[PDB]
Design a protein around this ligand. Structure first.
Ligand code: NI
Length: 59
DNA sequence: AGAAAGCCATTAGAG
DNA sequence: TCTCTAATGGCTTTC
């Protein structure tokens, strides 16, 4: 139908690692992480969005 | 300015 | 099936 990719343990970890420092990302930083983890800039953008949403409800 | 990014409510797919 | 979360739509805000 649409499709969905599940993020590896490494990817989710590195992403959660970066989020510990910068809760928001500049465009250059997103391109870096994308290449580093073999993800799309768009996928990195959305991940930080969703992860930001969980951080608001918990706090 | 106006693309881009954010917020947000919501959907749905894979494990 | 059940749950987690990737992914979308539709506005508003940013820069
Ligand atoms: Ni405008």
């Amino acid at each position: 139908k649409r499709g969905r990719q599940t993020y590896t343990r490494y990817q989710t970890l590195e992403l959660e690692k970066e989020f510990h420092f910068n809760r928001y990302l500049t465009r250059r930083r997103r391109i870096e992480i994308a290449h580093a983890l073999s993800l799309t800039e768009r996928q990195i953008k959305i991940w930080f969005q969703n992860r930001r949403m969980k951080w608001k409800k918990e706090n």
